[PDB]
Amino acid sequence: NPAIKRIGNHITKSPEDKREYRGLELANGIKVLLISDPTTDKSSAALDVHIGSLSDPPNIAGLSHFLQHMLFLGTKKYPKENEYSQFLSEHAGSSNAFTSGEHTNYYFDVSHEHLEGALDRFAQFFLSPLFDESAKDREVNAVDSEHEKNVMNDAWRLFQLEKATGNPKHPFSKFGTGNKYTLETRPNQEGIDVRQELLKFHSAYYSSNLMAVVVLGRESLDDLTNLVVKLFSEVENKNVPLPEFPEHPFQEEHLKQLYKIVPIKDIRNLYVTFPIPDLQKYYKSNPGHYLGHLIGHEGPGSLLSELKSKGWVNTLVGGQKEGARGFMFFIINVDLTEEGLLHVEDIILHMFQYIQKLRAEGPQEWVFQELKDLNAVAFRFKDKERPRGYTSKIAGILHYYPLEEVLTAEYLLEEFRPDLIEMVLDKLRPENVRVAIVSKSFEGKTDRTEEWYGTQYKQEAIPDEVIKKWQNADLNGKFKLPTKNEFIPTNFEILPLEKEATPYPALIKDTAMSKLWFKQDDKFFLPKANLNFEFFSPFAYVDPLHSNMAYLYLELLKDSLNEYAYAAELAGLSYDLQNTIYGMYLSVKGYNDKQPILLKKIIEKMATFEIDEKRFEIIKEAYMRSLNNFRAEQPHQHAMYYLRLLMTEVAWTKDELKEALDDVTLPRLKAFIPQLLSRLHIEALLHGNITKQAALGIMQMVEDTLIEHAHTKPLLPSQLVRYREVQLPDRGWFVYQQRNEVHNNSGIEIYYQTDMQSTSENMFLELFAQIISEPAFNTLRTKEQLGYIVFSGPRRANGIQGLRFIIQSEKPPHYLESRVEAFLITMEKSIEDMTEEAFQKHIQALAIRRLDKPKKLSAESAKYWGEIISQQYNFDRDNTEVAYLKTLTKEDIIKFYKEMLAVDAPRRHKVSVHVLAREMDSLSQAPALPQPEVIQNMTEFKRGLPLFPLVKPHIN
């Protein structure tokens, strides 16, 4: 009761937000944000400790991360380690945590009815944790699993490298993840007891004065106040001074430096970094966001436009980057063409030229006003968040903003400060520049190796003559400030719900040219709409060449429209356009206001598109590398790719695609585009703040624009063919084996093909997947330690389904095969032995997952789109299937497992894909497995088997 230091004033929110908020500070120093939502399906809480990796002891790298994993392992009130995860498993909840350089954030979600139970378990870890020594080894192996995952990832390698080139005395040079070496091998050699140092670090840094708690639930602000006071007033205050790092990790000796790095994928990137002071205090004016907007701009007269026109880069990322408290960065990152890689000095000269233009022309208030106005719209009409991510995020921002500004934080801009823009800009100079070039052209040309990832690199001082040239940069007439953004929305009217509005999408047009699904939004009432279009053409996937031409076409289309579309994206109007195995997919999402102008520009450009030869050659080269770079993808990704090729009627391989790519000449592409658009079928979904008439008007405008400019005619119904799944023989087992040449981990996908999708077959598979879900993770991952990726669940494709297992392990594929099979028998027992109460808990847990209500329009549109892309159109599926699921018995599941999934099942349809590790050679009792039929040639495999029928669509 007197355990509250203060209660904040009104928590500034959007008028559209019905959730009720209350900010307060407990006597111990804990900053609190309470969120009352009587409608919420799930309740949630989050605690963020303002201590992270940058505070790790130098002798124990990754200790903050280690403590994150250890803290939630038993308490005095709840001594069992399983208690927290078990309680959330039993009440449709989840939990997760993350460690950054200055924060350790713990969070969970649970069924709205069980907030007190869940929060009670959570709070105890912050009162009397036990840090159980039984799980010490397994948590160390978990931390090591995470680091080993990131070792071959080019982004994590670059992330650590930057840290290695700065001041080695600075906490910024620290390795924050940790691994087996830093948490076991080195402490043991050095005579460090990990447990006493863990306990030590905890005692010194885990103080309430550095903690922020966020609670979201059905309960009122008052009941939420009472609960948070009850469970968090006991958090010990040690009055810890919040760590600051005001010295920049890049001093004079770390500047005017050039780095030459070797990547894993065939990627070519340039990274330009300027050390800057911490700009967080100026958040109400945000001069870094201001400069980020201009330097990063993609509209006409932009730095990017000229860099692209010069044929040097394709993409650009610019602006402020976080460091820690006391130090930040201003970055200008570009990818490089083959010509760009030879014109790095020229690229950086253009970057400095652009910076100089902003200096000569000075700050612009109209630009800042535009940013302010866009941010206000974006905040006002922000989509509703899933509570788990909402609490976690707020727990962090509580440490940086007054209680009342916690929601507006990342949005509201106020005073224009030209003084600060001038200040930040004055730091963007050649004397302060850091350059990093990433390219395979440096293989065998480097002398240094980064210890944690093995990254190969060289370091050079940039010559004074180069710095002088960049300092002396002329003024370029190609660079001009962006003009006023005509995509800024103004019409925010929510259209009244029509008399004839429907709960699900309805077919409001069914012609030879198009099938139109429409639903006026009756849930979110934000001034937005989602416009999904599926274009069908037999010429988009007829052969590898055409598949490449479909891809090149849309990539060049997007490239040409970019300068125009960028203003729309800044204004909350975005689109996606990609080729499919059937034609093209187009999606326009955001504010409905200017939506038809963007859409009409896109349909027009599709049909009157004139290709720039220089861009075509550059996009073709980037696509060749992209096809090659798949070799550097994870072995499980490879295993899942090989199974889609094997099981789909028609599927062109990356090898066939890259082989036909050389035959894509410009005259062939120019000929392809009219041929592709000559005959189409359009299937659309228009969902949102729109009427039935407006929907018809949109569809009609897309047809009319194509008919006018491309002379489009409808396709024949007989031409609208969908690919079938390969029908496996009863009691058959096939294996397809390949090698991953990059990763030293194995990849596997095991598919037990069941049958064609139907209400009954769907829920047999979904309930069996629900039953074995937690156990497969506990047995195969927790107990057996097979690998970081242990996945099980239903697999659905082309109207067909089955059960799959996906594993990425150090162990061989044939071994994982016997382990999965061992588990299948272990579950045969576990189902016969479980109680009816336990069985009914699985049915309830599935029904809850299946009825999870979308929190935003996009999530609902995606669910409707799923029904459309599969041609099933079962919009009421969830309700029907849940109702059917509740009528299932334990016997039904036993009958099904016996007929389809058991080792001795009469209708067993097994197909495995084995992806060997880079260096790889070519417990419960595992059952006797037959000799597999090995697949040498995919064409012959496919030819030798029947093809399933295609699922019959659900009709009104």
Add this chain to the structure above:
Amino acid sequence: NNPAIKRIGNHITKSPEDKREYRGLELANGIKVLLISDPTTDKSSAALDVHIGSLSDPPNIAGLSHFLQHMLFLGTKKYPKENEYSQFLSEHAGSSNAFTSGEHTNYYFDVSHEHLEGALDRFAQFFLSPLFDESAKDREVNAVDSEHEKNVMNDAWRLFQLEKATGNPKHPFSKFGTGNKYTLETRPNQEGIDVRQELLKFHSAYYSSNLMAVVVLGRESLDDLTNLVVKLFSEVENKNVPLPEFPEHPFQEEHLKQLYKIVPIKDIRNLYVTFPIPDLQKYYKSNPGHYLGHLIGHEGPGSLLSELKSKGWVNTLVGGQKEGARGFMFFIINVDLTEEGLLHVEDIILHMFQYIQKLRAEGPQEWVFQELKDLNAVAFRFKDKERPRGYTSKIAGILHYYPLEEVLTAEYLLEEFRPDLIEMVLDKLRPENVRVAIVSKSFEGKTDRTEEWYGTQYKQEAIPDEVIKKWQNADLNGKFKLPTKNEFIPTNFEILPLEKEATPYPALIKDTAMSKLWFKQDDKFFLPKANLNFEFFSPFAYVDPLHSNMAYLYLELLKDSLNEYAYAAELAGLSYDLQNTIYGMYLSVKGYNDKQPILLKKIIEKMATFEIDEKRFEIIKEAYMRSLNNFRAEQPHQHAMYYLRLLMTEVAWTKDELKEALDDVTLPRLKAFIPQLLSRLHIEALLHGNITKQAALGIMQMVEDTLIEHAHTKPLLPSQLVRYREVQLPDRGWFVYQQRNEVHNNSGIEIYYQTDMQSTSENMFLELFAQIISEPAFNTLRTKEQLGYIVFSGPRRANGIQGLRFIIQSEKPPHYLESRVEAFLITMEKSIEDMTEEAFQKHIQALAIRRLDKPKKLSAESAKYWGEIISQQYNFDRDNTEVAYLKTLTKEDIIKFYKEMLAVDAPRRHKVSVHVLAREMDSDINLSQAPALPQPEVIQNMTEFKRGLPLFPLVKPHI
């Protein structure tokens, strides 16, 4: 020596390549005989040709000679049983047939070589003691009426009788030869005429041995055949009947300079030009009509056709002499018409007269005659061995026109050049002697006459003297020039020695990403010929209706542009076919191997460097549209078979989709399509004949090099070489697809009982059941129940799958045909239960012999090899393997198979029916009990049918 033999002919001129032995003789009763000894023959044959036909019919019964044809072979005093000859032949792998023309009635049969005497004895009995079973009178009248009812709906038969109806009505040429229900029943009954008594009067008046000719072919020696024929045909009664002669031409002055406007059934635009001529038969050693037909009907540069095509009036032309009867003949010039041609008939005829007058001005050419003589000399020498049945029937006719020694050289050898005779014939080709007939639907409603026998709507007009004058006065036209020396005439007839590494079946001698080459050097016929087959694969030939139309148009324009050059090769026995398929293009080059690489090079170069002429493109595009619409006028059984292929194949474009897409085929789109089609290909070839391994490899490389060079051809990926699958029918399912034929008033049906994928066992289970039911299906459904004119049964094979099919065309509704077929399968189930092991082994043996039956010419062997290649099974030794398995089969194996797959209540029944309704139709009697049939699932949309079903795998290859 023999008193029954009037005279034995001298040496029968034969080909030096022919191993068969020949003997000509005349019996004392006047019968002219040819005996053919062939110890090699699998089937023996005999034919009798009576020099009496339709032209001799009495006025009271039109079609009597033809009715006699049917009645004569129904019982004899020695073999009273009506169906003896039929059953005997059927029991010994034989067959029989007959035809009645205006001057001949020809009866023929074939049988297993071990049963010539048995078959010949029953055959001879019809010319000694016929009975004409009064019980089979009505069924014969119905058979004659069904035959005419089929002809009524045919454009060529209509024109045939209409030509006869526009001559002198008083001349026997105007007679209706077929007969029908009216002439054989309706009319004689209304007049008290005794059909039988009048039939017998005719037979007793005209059937005389001095007007008869007999050919016997067997494994027996010439001497044994001599004794056999003397024994069986010397007792045939001689009534010394005089040979009917027709010296007066049926076309007299009043039938000349006449114009006819005719309405056809199909949307066809044709022009027929005719001139009466004396009978030229007796000039056969010089053949002036052949010489003139060769020049008038020429298609090489300077030809009449070339100029009619350039003017855009016609696409095709046929020209030459046409048989009439003893005493009269016709000279014809027939062309089809473009839309413009139909408007320029007067000009087309002027051009025809210009070419004629040019021949007159140029005068006969000895060198032209020499080429024809030399070509015919090559043709006779290197002639393919004829099928025995057709061979005897042909000679039986020819025996009436030529001395015994010349019956084989008859229609081949040219001796003396007679420029005077050429001149005599050309003198009759003048505008004052012309007859002109235009056939077009543009005349519908614009006519006033009706030819009553067929119902043909026509109009007759005299040709203005004004028009005749223009034709008579036609200016000289320089576009008409005589053909030049035919450089394609073969000279190298060397049979290359059989290579040391020669194989009995084709061998894969080239296996690349671009091409699969199957090759076999001929080791049986040793004739200087070769067959070159190429299947060019492309996913763009059938990707959609448009591309399918473009592949069609492409190859039609290409055959049209190569035609002038190709025609000389065709005359020199070097022919080619080029067609689009559902997988790409098919090319076959057949004939004398000599100049073969030259023609092949020209076809491939032209394919790769094709320059389309806009005028031709529009004409061919217009012809194709009509060809697509003309499918509506095809018979209902043809429609039923087409609909089933649409339904059962993974991908298939309908005639309506093809014609909907045709208007989009522009000249720029077709020009873009060709390099696209040829850009990526796979070539699968079969080269079989008088060629070596080196020569075969050189041919394929030349084809590849030509495509690579001019079309920049690259290979297709093995994953792109996808074949279409058959639809997999559900166990115990019955599906029905129904449509209507808007032209014919007869139903069409195809019933398909899908079994399973082709395999040694499945194939022979189906082929033995098909063997067992084959004859009974005909005798029951066609002969006894009179279901229809068309009754067919046998295995169906498509996309590696098989089943049992029934194809029937009837006047009765499709659902009634369904019950009769179903009752018949019950009769067949009972029949197999009841049949003796003896009768069962006879079925195994009849099938085994049929399957092991050796090909008699190179093309028949290559076709067998091509069948294995196109199906991608490549099982060239199949017959030996399948016959060996078939022989192990028991009666129980077939009952088990019938019970599981075909029975009405079979657990794995897979029935699909196509019902084609008649034009005007809408939807005990001591007969077999039809079973309880379920309600069929009516297919409304073909796409939904295919989507809702699995697709079978494809058969695994042998190689």
